[PDB]
């Protein structure tokens with residue numbers, strides 16, 4: 472005897488998101504990432520991405536879940552983002568059904584995609600470690616501060632650290648994307664082997680293989696870069712322009728994401744400081760969640776520098792960003 476497919480009293484309808492559903496999507500997104508959800512600020516931009524499909528699950532005509540798929544890596548990879556189910560619909564298998572629908576959609580619409588990729592900060596259990604390959608992992612440092620408070624006291628803090636011999640910023644070098652410097656770094660095999668984590672660029676949780684096609688995607692985002700030495704690169708940092716996040720409920724918070732690649736902690740310190748100096752003036756009057764992704768063995772050094780040296784508040788303890796990959800057809 473076979474198992475008969477059983478019907479649901481209220482079947483799910485899967486549809487492509489439009490701008491009209493924005494408010495219903497916010498209504499399912501309360502509390503996500505403790506207020507660091509990017510989707511409020513990014514939803515409308517997602518609707519314009521030519522290789523992205525944003526899928527909504529609906530029950531009785533109302534949105535109850537969302538998942539985005541975006542084809543990258545010259546057609547070989549689908550990046551899965553934003554998976555969420557309304558709190559009043561969780562624990563029923565909705566995320567599973569949505570994932571199953573998006574898997575069918577990708578295979579139908581993008582038959583050349585070979586792998587799925589995603590980033591994830593929850594601990595990998597047996598089931599998870601069985602289904603995915605771990606490409607790489609970065610440590611996550613999350614600190615917060617009032618930008619005007621940082622601006623007022625930073626100079627004096629730096630002077631105290633210099634006078635005491637505790638810290639003086641090491642020289643860093645300019646990186647111009649328009650002038651070709653980013654391509655020279657990211658298309659270098661030695662940079663890919665020795666600097667990038669798992670040979671991968673991670674930018675604001677989004678993984679990219681280091682290729683010309685992906686560099687075009689990065690160049691449209693207005694990133695800022697810094698390096699220790701263009702001639703002999705060992706530490707490369709990438710700052711994503713800050714954007715509003717729902718934390719605090721009051722509109723005063725911005726999210727500043729910095730990805731750091733390489734093993735020299737002193738250079739990560741000096742480059743972090745450079746990015747903070749570049750970004751903080753435009754953030755006067757606002758509050759900042761600053762999240763730095765870096766090689767794990769540097770976390771403690773950077774946490775101390777941020778807290779004690781720079782007077783920023785540590786939001787939480789150590790966690791990790793996992794980059795995971797699975798074959799599409801198994």
Ligand SMILES: CC(C)(COP(=O)(O)OP(=O)(O)OC[C@H]1O[C@@H](n2cnc3c(N)ncnc32)[C@H](O)[C@@H]1OP(=O)(O)O)[C@@H](O)C(=O)NCCC(=O)NCCS
Nearest residue numbers: 503554555556557560561562563564565566567570590591
């Ligand atoms: C994560 C989230 C989307 C799950 O939605 P859900 O409908 O409750 O998940 P399901 O009921 O289908 O599955 C529950 C369990 O099944 C397990 N599971 C195993 N395989 C699964 C699969 N293919 N699909 C779904 N769940 C699976 C998971 O371990 C999951 O664990 P959990 O109870 O801790 O969530 C939901 O908790 C949420 O919206 N969180 C806020 C946003 C967020 O954190 N998203 C994840 C970012 S990577």
Ligand SMILES: CCCCCCCCCCCCCC(=O)N[C@@H](Cc1cnc[nH]1)C(=O)O
Nearest residue numbers: 551552553554570573574587589590591676
């Ligand atoms: C389903 C299609 C077939 C492929 C099979 C793979 C299934 C993967 C399921 C879900 C993966 C989770 C994706 C996600 O949500 N990543 C976070 C990262 C993040 C950003 N800021 C904080 N965290 C995000 O984009 O929000």
